[model samples]
Target: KVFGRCELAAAMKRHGLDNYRGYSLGNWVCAAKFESNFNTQATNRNTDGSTDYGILQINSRWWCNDGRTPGSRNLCNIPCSALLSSDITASVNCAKKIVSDGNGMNAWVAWRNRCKGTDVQAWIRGCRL
Candidate 1:
């Protein structure tokens, strides 16, 4: 997707991605790497109760806020334009806030502190994606 820090910030602000940008992109990249490798359109049904899809790994249940039906493909589908859209950031931010609060960046921070020492590409691509 065309989305990145700037685009995600815009979307997050609208959807309650508070304190999301304060941390480095390490965890976010790692999560994306592990989840979908930055594919933005990835969807998987994990047994851990985390139904992730799109760049942010949003749960499928969040579709209600996006105007999609409960089972709509767009429920958590992230596309190239999403990275460039304010709405996408908003939704993703809201979800993140609910998931990890301010500490949501733990995964990203871990990536930096342990793996690449803050090398964005490594953190973002460590999942072998």
Candidate 2:
């Protein structure tokens, strides 16, 4: 399902993403907006022969396992297909691993390119929760 902006923010917050690892909800909200436009089923094939999965676009090369990407670490210990359906649970769980593994949220280039070094609150401005 595609989440509305505010609902996506609320859902992510429920998973403890808000201020998790010192990254604000706004930062996450911004990442989701640009990464996959809050579409849970989104995917992108990378030139590196890996596929990015789900709303956060978690990559198969290092995070989830697509069983196709060479040298995929599967650090999240989940099938890449797990990230492509439903709510943010699977995606957020892997997201936590990514940032907490010391890669930081910048691992998602979208965040670094778009949300980093900026006041991201505007991304979730009207999110009531």
Candidate 3:
């Protein structure tokens, strides 16, 4: 399902992503905007033969198992399919695990390139969080 900007922001807030690991809610929203445009089913194949899945574009190389990545660690111990599911629970939880792992939000290049060091307040401007 494709979520509207405010809708996605509310969901992430519900899952406790606001200020998670010192990152602002807007940061996560901005990453989702660039990474998958709030589309729950988005996927991007990488040059390393790994696949990014879902709204947050969780990578298969280390987070989830697509059974195709060269040597997936499946650190979140979930199938990549779960990341693509309509529910954002798995995706949100996995994302938290990533930031908790010392990678910070930089684990997603989209965040680094787009959200990082940017004023992302607009991403959550209309959201009632």
Candidate 4:
């Protein structure tokens, strides 16, 4: 739910996390289900369009340090964890800001799914990761 579909998808793909074109839909579906419930407009408290902004709850001014609005694309270069921490939920919307970066969620799900003995990433590639 990055507000921009192509950018989000591309971001997810580039992170070595999720490979949509690889022909697996479960990871995408699970990610969508986990983050924002696949609701594009879902937002959290951290967004301000001046500081924090966008569907992914990107903090435009703080993270991007650009004068651009919160919803602007490719503005944030900071790692998602840098903005917060792993211990906190960081708000689901806030998480989507980073998770959608090039298969990021798939990578995340890969790690999480592993905890449950599910090999989603490998299943996508039809190999064990």
* Candidate 4 accuracy as lDDT: 0.41
Q: Write the per-residue lDDT of candidate 2 for residues 1-129, one digit (tens) a residue.
A: 999989988899899999999999999989988999989899999898999999999999888889899787998899999999786799999998888877688798999999999999898898789
Q: Which candidate do you rate higher for lDDT, 2 or 4?
A: 2
| Per-model TM-score versus the true fold | 0.42, 0.95, 0.95, 0.31
lDDT of 4 at 55: 29
Q: Is candidate 1 or candidate 2 better by lDDT?
A: 2
Summarize candidate 4's per-residue lDDT along 44-112 as a digit string, tens digits.
Answer: 443354543222334444444443454544335654333333222233334445555565544344235
Please report the TM-score between candidate 2 and the true structure. 0.95
Each prediction's total of clashing residue pairs, residues at least 3 apart in sequence or on different chains, is 8, 0, 0, 15
By TM-score, the candidates rank as 3, 2, 1, 4
Model 2 off-target regions past 4 Å?
none
| lDDT of residue 110 for candidate 1 | 29
Candidate 1 at 3: error in angstroms?
7.1
**Model 4 worst lDDT run, 10 consecutive residues:** 82-91
Better of 3 and 4 by TM-score: 3
